[PDB]
Design a binder for these strands. Structure first.
Ligand code: SF4
Length: 393
DNA sequence: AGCTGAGTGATCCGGAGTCTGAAACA
DNA sequence: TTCAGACTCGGATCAC
């Protein structure tokens, strides 16, 4: 029964959280994405020890290097048989921009070899049928996957009852009024808030509190937690004064220009005849097409439209207001000889934390309601990632 | 008692960032 | 003013 009270109090903290920020991050509602499960497995391979934008870029580089011949559609966008028949050198060169490329490429090749010598064709849709316990056991039975990876794959793709704790989640849960930094032990004397490394097996002390909650609740909690950690709780100087839990974050009680490059531009309606070469935008994005201005023009495209959805891990790599830069439209921008359209801001930069540092709360709210973020570029022809043009940031 | 052994504890893999201290000059 | 080396988004070992 005492277990019950703890569970209830945690449920309450979560509810206060998922709501309080819901007035800031807009609508983080569940939206399904296409794609097989092997896409998720390769993605969780790829994002093991690298930042999110770099991992997404490496994944799309893999996708464009070997695209599936093509005309929740659980069909892999990458012809993994080609990678099975490929060589280690070239595939490591494919993700050379990520690091660890030899090691990761070898691990991917070993995983694919294990799969094919197990049951022939490359397929894991049947993981959706077995009980979650045995599926979790078999996924963990692989090499190169710890517990965080399998928990993440299960929760965000197979919709089980799981909670992956990345660095942000552990830091957040140890720094707020939630579980302290002394779960099993008793420090009781530190006299500072240095946040020395406590990203570890704490889950045995946290998972019991999160045994019985809704799946959508856990999905939204994870999504909003990671974006909130990206924007508000950074390892170096959080904008703690501006966090709505300033009256509740335990760390805040201890004490009490070149980053952003924005251009006020106009968005593109979905029925503009000059956009006929732009993949025929799909209807499941709150945000729309954008155009960057300096007779002159340069277009912007949303991420989900650019990739046709079907991104691994249900597309949690990307922010809600995240757009791509068309490489062709950047190399030789189009001359379009348009003022009465609504004016919107682009907030260019290089990552999520870099752009949002130093900003006041109202500016954050504005850029989440009628704002946008872009940190990279994209080529329509080869469907591959490319470095961002230096003409803006 | 004299050999486990459990568990961590460093350390690794590796590009691209940024951040930060020294130097330098006043 | 430079700039250069340190540090920052897990899973294998391997030593203790
Ligand atoms: S109150 Fe400040 S330090 Fe605490 S989580 Fe919010 S932004 Fe971070």
């Amino acid at each position: 029964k005492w277990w019950e009270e703890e569970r209830n109090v945690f449920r309450g903290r979560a509810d206060s959280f998922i709501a309080r920020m819901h007035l800031v991050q807009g609508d983080r509602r569940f939206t399904p994405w296409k794609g097989s499960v092997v896409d998720s497995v390769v993605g969780v391979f790829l994002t093991q020890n690298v930042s999110d934008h770099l991992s997404s870029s490496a994944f799309m580089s893999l996708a464009s290097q070997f695209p599936v011949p093509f005309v929740r559609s659980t069909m892999d966008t990458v012809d993994w048989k080609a990678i099975r028949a490929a060589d280690v050198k070239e595939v490591a060169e494919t993700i050379k921009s990520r690091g660890m490329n030899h090691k990761l490429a070898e691990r991917i090749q070993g995983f694919l070899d294990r799969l094919v010598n197990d049951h022939g064709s490359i397929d894991l849709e049947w993981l959706r049928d077995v009980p979650p316990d045995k599926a979790k056991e078999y996924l963990l039975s692989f090499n190169g996957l710890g517990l965080k990876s399998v928990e993440c794959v299960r929760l965000l793709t197979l919709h089980h009852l799981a909670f992956p704790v990345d660095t942000n989640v552990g830091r957040i849960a140890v720094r707020l009024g939630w579980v302290p930094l002394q779960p099993l032990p008793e420090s009781l004397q530190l006299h500072l808030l240095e946040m020395y490394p406590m990203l570890e097996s704490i889950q045995k002390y946290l998972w019991p509190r999160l045994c019985k909650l809704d799946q959508k609740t856990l999905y939204e909690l994870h999504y909003q937690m990671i974006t909130f950690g990206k924007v508000f709780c950074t390892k170096s100087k959080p904008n703690c004064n501006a966090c709505p839990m300033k009256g509740e974050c335990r760390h805040f009680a201890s004490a009490f220009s070149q980053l952003r490059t924005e251009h006020r531009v106009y968005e593109l309606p979905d029925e503009h005849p000059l956009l006929a070469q732009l993949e025929k935008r799909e209807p499941d994005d709150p945000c729309s097409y954008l155009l960057a201005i300096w007779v002159r023009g340069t277009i912007l495209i949303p991420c989900r439209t650019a990739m046709r959805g079907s991104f691994p891990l249900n597309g949690t790599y990307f922010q809600v207001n995240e757009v791509f830069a068309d490489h062709a439209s950047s190399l030789n921008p189009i001359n379009v000889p348009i003022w009465e359209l609504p004016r919107r801001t682009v907030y260019f930069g290089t990552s999520v934390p870099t752009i949002f540092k130093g900003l006041s709360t109202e500016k954050i709210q504005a850029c989440f309601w009628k704002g946008y973020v872009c940190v990279r570029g994209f080529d329509r022809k080869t469907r591959g990632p490319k470095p961002l043009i230096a003409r803006l940031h």
